[PDB]
From a paper:
Using single-particle cryogenic electron microscopy (cryo-EM), we determined the structure of EmbB from M. smegmatis expressed in E. coli and reconstituted in lipid-filled nanodiscs to 3.3 Å resolution. The next 11 TM helices adopt a typical GT-C glycosyltransferase fold, structurally similar to enzymes from various glycosyltransferase families: mycobacterial AftD from GT5315, archaeal ArnT from GT8316, yeast Pmt1-Pmt2 from GT3917, and bacterial PglB from GT6618. Conservation analyses reveal that this cavity contains highly conserved charged residues (D285, D286, R389, E391), where the residues corresponding to D285 and D286 are required for catalytic activity of corynebacterial EmbB (D297 and D298)19 and mycobacterial EmbC (D293 and D294)20. Based on this structural comparison, the lipidic donor (DPA) is likely to bind in the pocket formed by TM helices 7–9, on the right side of the cavity, with the soluble acceptor substrate binding to the left. We observe two bound lipids in our structure, in a pocket formed by TM helices 2, 5, 6, 7, and 9 on opposite leaflets. A tightly bound phosphatidylglycerol lipid and calcium cation that likely serve a structural purpose were evident in the density map, and their presence and identity were confirmed using native and denaturing mass spectrometry. Notably, these mutations are closer to the putative DPA binding site, suggesting that ethambutol might interfere with recruitment of the arabinose donor, thereby inhibiting enzyme function.
EmbB and EmbC have mutations known to lead to ethambutol resistance, while a clear effect of the drug on EmbA activity has not been established.
Residue numbers in the entry: 21 to 500, 526 to 1082
Write the structure that this text describes.
């Protein structure tokens, strides 16, 4: 017979799936082992090898005694794991130095083996053995002994047991030259516990597990088919017909996909995905020491396989569109009819569902973070559980358990899906205790275990359990957007109306209560979550639309035979809308450019709009009170107003968002907008790089001074300069920064530079200059003083503008003046910045062959005050009769903090970012700017080692200072330790093509402290047990 066959098959297949799937984590795996030796080509030349883990698994080194005899009297590095002139190299690295009397080994601010030099060069000493491993950091000087102290007579071994004392390796640097001596050699064993590939056994077990689970579910299907019920071959009318709500939702989703905003964590996911295939494992790439997101990481591998085609924004986030359409179909054609005949008979409920799904999908679930996919999985789970309860079969329950497992394996906030299994638990238990009689217990229970457990074969493919435990150890040791509450405003009324009246005429109790309990359970899980509650709201997009479709029926006049309650509900909706129109931080970093309200709350007329909604709420509530006092019923006006409040509210918010985005596009057309760039991607577009402009050499367009008799200030002051002095700038003023006395991460080389220069400029200046300006070609004038103050003027010489041509005039849209002080100028974030006057006065050549002025131009001064920053003067605001131009500066403030400093102007020689950086140079793109710079190549990493970057792109000042500098600091596991220790940064002069007051971000050039070349690593392989760990990593002292 076939029933007994299917029983046996189900049992054996499910048990095998459970066993093998539990065993996948503990099974062996092949790891590639890299190691690094510094003398490579038999010559003493420096070498770079930036480890992303900021420490090796072990280090050994051997140094003869003769090398000390070869250096000069003032020797230096015999070797070091970072350059001696680097930033905090003596705090983060190993250094073997010779200070003219002592041969010192300095591990991180710790002096191990400090020994005289006249002994090491003697005839007794032979070698120096240095070893840093988990057992400690020790150094032995063979042939010698301790002469002084309590340790006298015993060997010259010295050091400390501390596994957190292992150095940070970004190379092997020295000061020696020539051939290599016999014995000098280091050996670093790099940590590569994450980059692996499976054995044949593990792979075969995973494949057999998936096959057996499929076999078991097929056999359980053949067992569920024992009842005479069948699926009819015809499709129903609802899946065949099409409506207008379908068109509205689909069109809105498409238009928002192209034109609309994007989430905040996009570059995070994109850079992880792009670097995963070269690495060999999904790394976070910004934090936590190259540790993976592998326990919740398979969607990222889907994105990584997608990146092999293109990295555009219109392709990599197609899953959002797919999942949106799937949610809409499953919600309109499987969720609403099963709630009852009332729902799916009305149109208002369908409009409510569609519009709420739109409004919740818009700010959050358009991007790359998987919140919308989680919502889709939860909806699929609910649908399959309801189909199981209705049809009485157990296969959709198993498929729903599988879907819940995967939805949890996307992101830890997928536990919402599991809530469905907690709601539809007792029905499935009833089914199991009902079918236990006909067929036994194990044929049913085994496939469910196999379904729940098959996720371990996908989640632990390229990883083991020890790696995951280590990654969690690091993540726990180190630390860790319009408001929408349609969810709550729809959960409260449906809840109270299901509690008030027991049974509703034409509505199902079970499905509604299950949906409501799902939502309450996940809100419970989320209030315990340390992250802010409002950020995780895209999970309630589809289920929230379902609850809205339910709520629009439980408040209509067909059930609520009282007007006062409906007016109260209207007051509630309007109060909610006011609370959502007030609390809005804005949009995030590229959608907030052309939006109407960028630095305020909405304000039309003469007072904010939230006040108008609170006022409408007040009228509604007082009207309800009057209805209560007149004790009337069934007034036609209320039946006209309270026909459908929720769809009207949702449509209002939808139209608001779409209008904001379309206004941002039309107001900001030729330069960057999300929609314009995405439309441009089909034609070879590259995003913000196409619009952003940069000066390769920031001294290229300095204008020629006309002839004149001038003073010691030079041509810049001019014929009566008062209160301006060439060295009139404070000690430490730098480019786009403030130079706090205590340091910060991710800072340029200008911070730690000296105060004064060794050689003065043309005029008697000593001030450093920001953007690579050579003080032998660029004068300065400033008014800061310390003995007594005075009112200061400056009116420079007429600087001859270049020429009168059209192509040149098109390529040269600016005249720029570098200045530091409190200067007035327009902007976007904060317009009309009050302060002192630095203006650009232009001329028109008279008929006598002589000059005479016409007017002035006011700048666009974006950037931190009182930093060295570029002041922008467009050439569109200048008449084409212009031939000459001068600076006019006034200081009418006797306070010691209101000071001015200026340089001469320049018509820069610009070009785009894509024309200079290209798509082959490595770049350190922060986690905010990856979706606008897709064509740029990030700094990959493979086998523990990274690539030395040549550039760094970053967001605006406050975001760089508050978000990225702190996230990927070296103390927390980021990449800026490597760059701060190995490289020296310098900020560049960048502009945006037609928004001269917008702060798109910053571009920084990296230069090398010392000349060096990449390393030739040595490879091998080892097979592990699955539970193997070579001790813990270094994360903390
Ligand atoms: C990767 C994501 C794939 C999602 C699949 C969703 C398909 C939805 C649209 C299909 C068109 C159907 C037209 C049939 C028209 C039709 O006859 O309706 C098919 C059936 C309802 O059938 P009838 O209406 O004939 O049912 C009898 C009733 O009329 C009487 O009550 O609806 C379903 O069961 C749909 C749900 C399938 C869901 C299966 C999902 C299982 C795979 C899980 C994927 C996991 C994703 C992981 C997380 C991201
Ligand atoms: C009831 C059964 C339902 C179907 C269950 C899924 C079927 C199995 C398909 C994936 C097995 C993994 C691939 C083999 C594993 C293998 O042999 O290669 C393991 C491979 C090791 O490669 P290396 O470490 O050399 O490099 C990989 C790197 O290049 C990328 O990280 O790592 C991967 O590529 C990670 C796999 C990502 C997996 C992406 C797929 C995620 C599942 C998508 C389907 C989920 C929805 C299911 C609907 C219910
Ligand atoms: Ca791997
Ligand atoms: Ca002053």
């Amino acid at each position: 017979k076939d029933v007994r066959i299917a029983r046996w098959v189900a049992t054996i297949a499910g048990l095998l799936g459970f066993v093998l799937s539990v065993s996948i984590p503990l099974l062996p795996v092949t790891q590639t082992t890299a190691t690094l030796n510094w003398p490579q080509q038999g010559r003493l030349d420096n070498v770079t090898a930036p480890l992303i883990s900021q420490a090796p698994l072990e280090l050994t080194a051997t140094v003869p005694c003769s090398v000390v005899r070869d250096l000069p009297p003032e020797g230096g590095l015999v070797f070091g794991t970072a350059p001696a002139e680097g930033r905090d190299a003596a705090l983060n690295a190993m250094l073997v130095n010779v200070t003219e009397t002592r041969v010192d080994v300095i591990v991180r601010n710790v002096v191990v083996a400090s020994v005289n030099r006249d002994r090491v060069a003697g005839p007794d000493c032979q070698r120096i053995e240095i070893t840093s491993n988990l057992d400690g950091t020790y150094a032995d000087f063979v042939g010698l002994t301790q002469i002084s102290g309590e340790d006298a007579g015993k060997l010259q071994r010295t050091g400390y047991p501390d596994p957190n004392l292992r150095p940070a390796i970004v190379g092997v640097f020295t000061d020696l030259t020539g051939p290599a001596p016999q014995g000098l050699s280091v050996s670093a064993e790099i940590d590569t516990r994450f980059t692996t590939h499976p054995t044949a056994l593990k792979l075969a077990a995973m494949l057999l597990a998936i096959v057996s689970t499929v076999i078991a579910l097929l056999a359980l299907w053949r067992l569920d088919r024992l009842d005479g019920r069948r699926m009819h071959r015809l499709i129903p009318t609802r899946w065949r017909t099409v409506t207008a709500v379908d068109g509205v939702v689909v069109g809105g989703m498409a238009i928002w996909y192209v034109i609309g905003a994007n989430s905040s964590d996009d570059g995070y996911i994109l850079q992880m995905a792009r670097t995963a295939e070269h690495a060999g494992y999904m790394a976070n790439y910004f934090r936590w020491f190259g540790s993976p997101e592998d326990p919740f990481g398979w969607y990222y591998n889907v994105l990584a396989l997608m990146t092999k085609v293109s990295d555009a924004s219109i392709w990599i986030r197609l899953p959002d569109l797919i999942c949106a359409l799937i949610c809409w179909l499953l919600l309109s054609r499987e969720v609403l009819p099963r709630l009852g005949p009332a729902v799916a008979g009305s149109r208002a409920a369908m409009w409510a569902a569609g519009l709420v799904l739109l409004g919740a999908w818009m700010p959050f679930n358009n991007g790359l973070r998987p919140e919308g996919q989680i919502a889709t999985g939860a909806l699929i789970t609910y649908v399959l559980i309801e189909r199981a309860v209705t049809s009485g079969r157990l296969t959709p329950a198993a498929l729903a358990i599988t879907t819940a497992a995967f939805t949890l394996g996307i992101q830890p906030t997928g536990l919402i899906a599991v809530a469905a299994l907690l709601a539809g638990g007792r029905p499935i238990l009833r089914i199991v205790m009902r079918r236990r009689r006909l067929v036994g217990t194990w044929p049913l229970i085994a496939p469910l275990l196999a379904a729940g457990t098959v996720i371990l074969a996908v989640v632990f493919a390229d990883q083991t359990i020890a790696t995951v435990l280590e990654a969690t150890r690091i993540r726990t040791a180190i630390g860790p957007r319009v408001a929408f509450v349609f969810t709550a405003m729809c959960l409260f009324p449906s809840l109270f109306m299901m509690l008030r009246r027991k049974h509703i005429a034409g509505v199902a109790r079970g499905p509604a209560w299950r949906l409501m309990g799902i939502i309450f359970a996940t809100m419970f899980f989320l209030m315990f979550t340390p992250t802010k509650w409002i950020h995780h709201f895209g999970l309630f997009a589809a289920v929230g639309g379902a609850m809205a479709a339910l709520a629009t029926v439980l408040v209509s006049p067909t059930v609520l035979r009282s007007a006062r309650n409906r007016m109260a509900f209207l007051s509630l909706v309007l109060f909610v809308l006011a609370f959502c129109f007030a609390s809005t931080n804005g949009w995030w970093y590229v959608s907030n450019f052309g939006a109407p309200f960028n630095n305020s709350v909405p304000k039309v007329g003469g007072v904010q709009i939230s006040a108008i909604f609170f006022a409408l709420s007040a009228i509604a509530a007082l009207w309800a009170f009057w209805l209560h006092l007149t004790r009337r019923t069934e007034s036609r006006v209320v039946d006209r107003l309270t026909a459908a409040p929720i769809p009207v509210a949702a449509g209002f918010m939808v139209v608001v968002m779409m209008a904001s985005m379309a206004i941002g596009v039309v107001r900001q057309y030729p330069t960057y907008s999300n929609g314009w760039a995405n439309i441009r991607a089909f034609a070879g577009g590259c995003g913000l790089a196409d619009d952003v402009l940069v000066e390769p050499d920031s001294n290229a367009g300095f204008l020629t001074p006309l002839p004149g008799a001038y003073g010691p200030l030079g041509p810049l002051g001019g014929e009566d300069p008062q209160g301006f002095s060439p060295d009139g700038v404070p000690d430490r003023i730098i480019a786009e920064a403030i130079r706090l006395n205590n340091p910060q991460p991710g800072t340029d080389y200008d911070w730690n530079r000296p105060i004064k220069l060794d050689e003065p400029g043309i005029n008697g200046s000593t001030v450093p200059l920001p953007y690579g300006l050579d003080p032998k070609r660029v004068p300065v004038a400033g008014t800061y003083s310390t003995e007594a103050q005075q009112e200061s003027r400056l009116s420079s010489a007429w600087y001859e503008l270049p020429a009168r041509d059209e192509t040149e005039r098109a390529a040269h849209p600016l005249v720029v003046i570098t200045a530091a002080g409190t200067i007035t100028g327009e902007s976007v974030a904060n317009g009309l910045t009050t302060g002192q006057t630095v203006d650009l006065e232009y001329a028109t050549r008279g008929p006598d062959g002589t000059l005479v002025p016409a007017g002035r131009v006011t700048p666009y001064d974006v950037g931190p005050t009182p930093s060295w920053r570029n002041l922008r003067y467009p050439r569109s605001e200048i008449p084409d009769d212009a031939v000459a131009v001068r600076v006019v500066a006034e200081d009418l403030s006797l306070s010691q903090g209101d000071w001015i400093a200026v340089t001469p102007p320049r018509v820069p020689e610009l070009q785009s970012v894509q024309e200079y950086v290209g798509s082959d140079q490595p770049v350190l793109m922060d986690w905010a700017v990856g979706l606008a710079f897709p064509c740029q190549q990030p700094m990959l990493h493979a086998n523990g080692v990274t690539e030395v970057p040549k550039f760094r792109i970053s967001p605006d000042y406050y975001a760089k200072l508050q978000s990225t500098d702190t996230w990927q600091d070296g103390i927390n596991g980021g990449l800026l330790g490597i760059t701060d220790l190995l490289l020296r940064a310098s900020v560049m002069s960048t502009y945006l093509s037609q928004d001269w007051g917008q702060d798109w971000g910053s571009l920084r050039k990296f230069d090398t402290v010392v000349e060096a070349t990449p390393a030739e690593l040595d490879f091998g392989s080892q097979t592990h047990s699955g539970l193997y760990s070579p001790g813990p990593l270094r994360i903390r002292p």
